[PDB]
Design a protein around this nucleic acid. Structure first.
Ligand SMILES: O=c1ccn([C@@H]2O[C@H](COP(=O)(O)O)[C@@H](O)[C@H]2O)c(=O)[nH]1
Ligand SMILES: [Mg+2]
Ligand SMILES: [Mg+2]
Length: 672
RNA sequence: GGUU
């Protein structure tokens, strides 16, 4: 009655290979719950994706499901803003379809709370069916049934969908676990960990058995296999409270007017061996996940913060890259090899910046830092000349304290020139590792590419920029976009450039890890970095891609054996998980950031919090999305509530109200 | 996108 009956695998599976139906995985809009699409590559079709707009078109399918779709007649296709499909695609149309069936899966339980509307609509005896609101907004509300609504009101629950009948406007399901109270820090972190499928259990006894037992020390056997650099002034430069030091650097005068620079990375592969429980776990996690109030390390704590970590005044192993630069800052020598180092100081970015800028400081570390700063400044200019994108992101530091429920302060992270110096040096080391490894193993090198933006990606944003400042963004090359981004300036508002440099990050494709045999040498290109070949080598403590590159670099030099990296399915499955786990760890981090911003705003509960500048960043049929740079929060405001819908990129004054829900507004323009 |  409300939906068309689904088809049986009898005609579903035949139709897909027949071509009468197309098959793909459902991707639902993070903004709109009832708007999806299937991306893929079908036979006899020029298009890369089919839209599934509406509840009737999505036919009860959930995000992630493997749906079978039937194309709507080309007359019903969605344009840019009886015919042939090719005629329609030439006039910029997008294919449209209706979900005709689903492929059974282990569809995850969803974290969330009972929909507050249902709690307000009620004021209990017996069993009652009520609506559950999954935290994931791509998932519709599920109807659950409990005889203890009272004991569940304030709880975070996990719900599994059981079915969605042809006549029900919502699917039915049931709760499988009570995770805790809504608002609880540990429950809200468990929600984030579960929603992003983060493995976060303690390491097994098998994993801890892989660590070195007893008092750890550098051995004479290993020293006779390493370049001993312990007499060199090596330092590390990291954020505050960083116990995991992945890289350290040195710099000195050599051969008259030349400079030697080493980038010394933690020798994780000395402790982490292939085929062990520890490596099996590190491979699965693939990356360390960082939350506001906690972190889920890829490797055990003993390695992370002690034996691998380049700790100051402790002898440590390392896998170093070294270069000799001439007067023109051109490399005259390059060395990859295993070393034994001893960091003189584990510095914080600001301390390094003060040291460089203090005229009274003539210490070996201060001088080395000035040299690395000089050299890095040169690398940044060559990179802007190359066409590298210089984009912006906002990260907040949350001031927590055991005596307060909510964080007492929220400020942006501090940035110094030493932050750019470390970035340049790591970008330099990773690119040297990429080239060196690829010279040895052209058919299975773990690399990192970034495709150029999709077609018409900057259209919407360009309509607004050209309207406001008379400029357009040119994505033909990395260099053109970088030069046109430099011209994106509003003379009456200095934030405009940083805002555009932030919104342009949302128009780019995700960068991906890959085996060098998947594509041609020209497809190795990193659009964002304007580089022909790139990889991650500098963080094996917190990234498994780096572990694989350190392995391949040792086999490239012949100081280790080659592994079966070699098996095609295996090297392409390795990249696949690196990409999945990387994405989930990014969502987990952003989720935790939003969480703590909500907790900070709880300090002004039922109180009046002052109004800050905001910008119109998105415009749907129904809502105006406003970004408040001060808090890094995006508000959703209904067009029905406004005297006039503001234009895209308009700088408005945003009213913020805490009623535990956050309400946004535009100071002027609200209907009374 | 990118660095720690
Ligand atoms: O994705 C990341 C990577 C690193 N860090 C921060 O960077 C610091 C530098 O250490 P590392 O984790 O990069 O080795 C860490 O202490 C941590 O605070 C993050 O917050 N997120
Ligand atoms: Mg580090
Ligand atoms: Mg690191």
């Amino acid at each position: 009655a409300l939906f068309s009956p689904h088809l049986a695998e009898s005609a579903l599976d035949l139709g897909v290979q027949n071509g009468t139906y197309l098959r793909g995985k459902l991707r639902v809009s993070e903004t709109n719950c009832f708007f999806g699409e299937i991306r893929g590559q079908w036979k006899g079709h020029n298009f890369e994706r089919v839209l599934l707009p509406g509840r009737t078109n999505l036919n009860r399918a959930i995000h992630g499901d493997i749906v079978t779709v039937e194309l709507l007649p080309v007359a019903s296709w969605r344009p840019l803003r009886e015919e042939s499909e090719g005629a329609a695609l030439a006039r910029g149309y997008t294919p449209v379809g209706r979900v005709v069936g689903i492929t059974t899966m282990n569809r995850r339980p969803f974290c969330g709370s009972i929909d507050v509307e249902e709690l307000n609509k009620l004021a209990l005896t017996g069993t009652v069916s009520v609506l559950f609101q999954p935290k994931d907004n791509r998932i519709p509300r599920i109807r659950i049934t409990t005889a203890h609504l009272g004991d569940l009101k304030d709880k975070r629950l996990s719900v599994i969908i059981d079915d969605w009948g042809e006549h029900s406007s919502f699917p039915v399901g049931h709760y499988v676990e009570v995770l805790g109270t809504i608002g609880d820090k540990d429950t809200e972190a468990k929600v984030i960990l579960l929603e992003n499928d983060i493995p976060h259990y303690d390491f097994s006894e098998a994993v801890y058995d892989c660590l070195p037992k007893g008092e750890w020390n550098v051995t004479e056997e290993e020293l006779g296999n390493r370049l001993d650099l312990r007499d060199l002034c090596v330092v590390s430069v990291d954020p505050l409270g960083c116990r995991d030091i992945d890289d350290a650097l040195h710099c000195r005068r050599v051969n008259g007017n030349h400079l030697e620079v080493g980038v010394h990375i933690a020798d994780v592969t000395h402790f982490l061996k292939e085929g062990t429980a520890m490596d099996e776990e590190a491979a699965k996690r693939s990356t360390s996940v960082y939350l506001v109030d906690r972190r889920i390390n890829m490797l055990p704590q003993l390695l992370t913060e002690n034996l691998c970590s380049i700790v100051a005044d402790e002898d440590r192993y390392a896998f170093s890259i070294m270069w000799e630069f001439d007067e023109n800052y051109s490399v005259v020598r390059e060395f990859f090899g295993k070393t034994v180092i001893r960091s003189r100081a584990a510095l914080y970015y600001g301390d390094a910046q003060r040291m460089i800028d203090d005229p009274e400081d003539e210490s070996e570390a201060a001088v080395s830092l000035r040299y690395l700063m000089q050299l890095s400044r040169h690398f940044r200019k060559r990179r802007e000349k190359d066409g590298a994108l210089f984009l912006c992101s906002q990260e907040f530091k949350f001031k927590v304290d055991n005596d307060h429920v909510n964080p007492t302060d929220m400020q942006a992270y501090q940035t110094f020139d030493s932050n750019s110096m470390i970035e340049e040096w790591m970008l330099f080391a990773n690119a040297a590792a990429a080239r060196r490894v690829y010279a040895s193993f052209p058919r299975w090198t773990l690399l990192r590419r970034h495709q150029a933006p999709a077609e018409n990606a900057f259209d919407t944003l360009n309509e607004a920029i050209r309207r406001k400042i008379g400029v357009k963004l040119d994505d033909t090359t990395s260099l053109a976009l970088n030069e046109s981004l430099e011209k994106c300036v509003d003379p009456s508002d200095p934030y405009f450039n940083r805002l555009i440099r932030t919104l342009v990050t949302r128009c780019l494709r995700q960068a991906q890890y890959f085996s060098s045999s998947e594509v041609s040498k020209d497809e190795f290109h990193h659009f964002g970095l304007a580089m022909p070949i790139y990889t991650h080598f500098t963080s094996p403590i917190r990234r498994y891609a780096d572990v694989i590159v350190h392995r391949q670099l040792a086999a490239a030099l012949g100081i280790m054996d080659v592994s079966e990296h070699m098996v095609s399915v295996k090297m392409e499955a390795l990249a696949s998980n690196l990409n999945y786990r990387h994405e989930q760890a990014q969502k987990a981090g952003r989720d935790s950031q939003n969480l703590f911003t909500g907790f900070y705003l709880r300090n002004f509960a039922n109180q009046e919090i002052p109004s800050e500048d905001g910008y119109v960043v998105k415009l749907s049929e129904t809502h105006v999305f406003v970004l408040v740079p001060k808090y890094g929060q995006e508000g959703k405001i209904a067009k029905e509530t406004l005297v006039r819908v503001p234009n895209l990129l308009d700088k408005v004054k945003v009213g913020i109200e805490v009623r535990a829900s956050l309400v946004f507004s535009i100071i002027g323009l609200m209907k009374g």
